């Protein structure tokens, strides 16, 4: 609840404070959230229980996206485009935090997507960090990042697009983690799920919203099923 | 900002006093600065300027007057002494002792209005002696004895109108100037001056309708209509210099209408046409100068250097003529704007 | 929205249909969700737009927990306690689906925890699947599973406990994935984050709610930071 | 006149893209012409100008940003990328990395207001470094981090006023 | 080469609208300036004014086109863009102000060039003075003619600026 699911937000704040050791914008956002967490806990201690619940729900998404940004910064310490999009999401998050602090309604509108934005951002960051010599789709992942930048511009045309990008990253991050612990059965199994993933991405880049999303989700599911065996192959 | 302006105007007062030859007014100015009186500071400044203009003129009466005005800090008396020293210079240029008496009296009474009256009356007497207008000189002396700045300015404008009429030959304009001098109407005298100028332009061009409108304005006393007629006359003169008789006719129509905006617009169009013509002529002159330069280059000699230098001088003269046309057009725009 | 974030639910349904090839209870739940997805899309096509949004939000959590259960079944095909808790969560999910279909309000109450339950369940399943010879904490993970079973009993005393169990699994799953692609710098780096993780777990088993959660979250963050380098160590 | 203006602005978009080094933006512009979207045409044009000013500046972030903006037809994002490439040139003339970060962030967020803010803030930082006004450079950096075009223009005008004062 | 302007002129002749015909003339002039400079937005605004028949907007577009032409002659693309913005706005006051600023920049440039030419002419004169000969007098006269031509060019620039001010005032 407003103080019984804010202990989960408190563990999230403790994780982010220990996972955002750089980007002082991240530390400042964590401090503004803890103050917003403090403001909600005071409203949770005050008679403003519904306002407490609303502020706590906003700060929960805030802490979730902040953890996404911190994990991205930890997983994208070498990608300049990723650091740029991360600082951009940090500025957008400060703007959305000022808007919600202004009672703006439109808080869970851009941050509604900026939450998914930080999700896909940490997704691409993990895809790059768990990569190695042969990314083989980091260009596509950069294209997706471009599509994410495009989603950064498509934020209304990015609600399902952010989900599709995250699912494609998951099919890539599953394949990336499989190839990471591989020295080649896991690589061959991920080469077939990555095939359907790239086919759907071209279809998702062909204006296919349901069919390409379904194909990418099925490719990700098959990749996760093969990862269940690849995790015992080493 | 009162004490700072006081110290500044008083330092300027002391400087203009030392330049006038007054260390006493300089010390009084230093005192005005130390006290912080911007009024006394500007008073010592105007008195120092008065003493300078007097040392330029040569009257110790107004000199001691400005000295005392600075020692006391009299701004009205200092401005009166300054305008009276200007009147004394204008009178030494003219030569009227009653004007000098009236100017010294305005400086002593501290009447800056009477001092400007004496200045305008000395100017009126000078303009009358230059024109030969005894009514203007009489009105100037009457204004100096009376201390009427309006009457003295009217006498000056009437003497100027009579001068413009005698130079034009417009006895109607001279009569209007004499009537304005007798009336003391500086507006009517300025209208007579503008009408005499418009009639002079009409006679120099040959626009009898323009000279007729000028005489009508002089009989009426409309400085606006007279200035519009003068603008239309200058526009028609530029048109005849260019060859736009339609422009001269439009100028006649506008002068008959009495507005100067259309006259200025027509003068601007004529100046634009003349400027395009002068630009073509200057391009031709530059081509000729470059050709003479190439000729002197291919075979230099006495005749070659002679022709090259002559072409350079011809291009410079054509550029000077085009610049003079542009300056006339700009002066027309300024008189219009 | 109610039909613009249900395409994301549709990709989730496509993933779960391709990731739940066993446990016909999972296929039946996916079918009931697709019917609930169909019911919401009809209400999204009907004038019941707020009811459509509510049913779509419920079915979104349903599909998320169903994907969690499918990934668990794919990652816990050998743990009888995990399969038992999975069938139990499947029965609880059928009950919560019947309750929400009855308009029960208490749908996002047990399923509110049953969502976190499926989260921690897939977490422990991945911890077991990405394990190898030396689990070294699968007993603790079973203890956590017991604590999860206890959370299965503590479902009110499990809202922050489920989050803590998931964070401890993440600190374990990070260490598990690090040791998986390792043949020993990553193992030594994970041995220090696992130390703080076990210390907090004992503290979390010592009735420490904020301090132990913070210590486990910081251990997980340090483990994820070391995993950023361990992913390039092979 | 909508389809004709679309074809014209999109042909100009493709030309400025090929001059920027973008054949992809050139093809997206040809597509904007074939579709008849004057908005998408002017978007690809502003994005092509953005890519040209970026190739003049040297930031592949705003370059790919304008490439994606032209591929999609985002006029606000293209104008943001153009003003941000201007900001990047002004910053390379000045030398402020936080200004470059703010400009790239304005280009990515597509905030043409924040992009003009970054341009005016880079100009303000340059004018402050030329004048020696640390308050002006601080206000410029604050506006770049905030994205306030009014504050950045104020910092620029204040650095210019301080320069005129020091010269006077 | 503006068939839209020719069509607007024919339509005004059939209508007997001297205002529409003058707007078509100003639009054809603005389109000519746009084609000579390369301002397709200016030619587009000229065609739009010809189709509309707005002599004020067409004259503003022509003023902005002349301003952008002076800018290209100087090298102020920002001035050409501001002229495009003003012509799209349809006012000629901003176009005239921009043309005046461009003419001021070009006038400062021409003043620097004329000072350099006068220095070169004085140097050639000193050279012919130190050792007069065929080549010396040739170079001195050539430098004098070059200074005269540079002065003629600066005067032509000043005349163009003054004509712009006159068309504006």
Residue numbers in the entry:
A (entry chain R), C (entry chain 1): 1 to 234
B (entry chain Y): 1 to 337
D (entry chain Q): 1 to 168
E (entry chain K): 169 to 337
From the manuscript:
To investigate the photophysics of special pairs independently of the complexities of native photosynthetic proteins, and as a first step toward creating synthetic photosystems for new energy conversion technologies, we designed C2-symmetric proteins that hold two chlorophyll molecules in closely juxtaposed arrangements. We describe de novo-designed proteins that hold Chl dimers in precisely defined, closely juxtaposed geometries.
As a first step toward such structures, we sought to incorporate a Chl-binding special pair protein into a two-component supercomplex with octahedral symmetry. The C2 symmetry axes of 12 copies of the SP2 dimer and the C3 axes of 8 copies of a C3-symmetric homotrimer were aligned with the C2 and C3 axes of an octahedron. Twenty-one designs were experimentally characterized, and one was found to assemble into octahedral structures by negative-stain EM. In this nanocage, the SP2-like component shares 87% sequence identity with the original SP2 design and its absorbance spectrum had a red-shifted shoulder in the Qy region, similar to the original SP2−ZnPPaM complex. The cryo-EM structure of the 600-kDa octahedral nanocage with 24 ZnPPaM molecules bound to it was solved to 6.5 Å resolution, with the helices well resolved. The cryo-EM structure is very similar to the computational design model in both the protein−protein interfaces and the overall architecture. The asymmetric unit of the cryo-EM structure agrees with the design model to 3.4 Å backbone r.m.s.d.
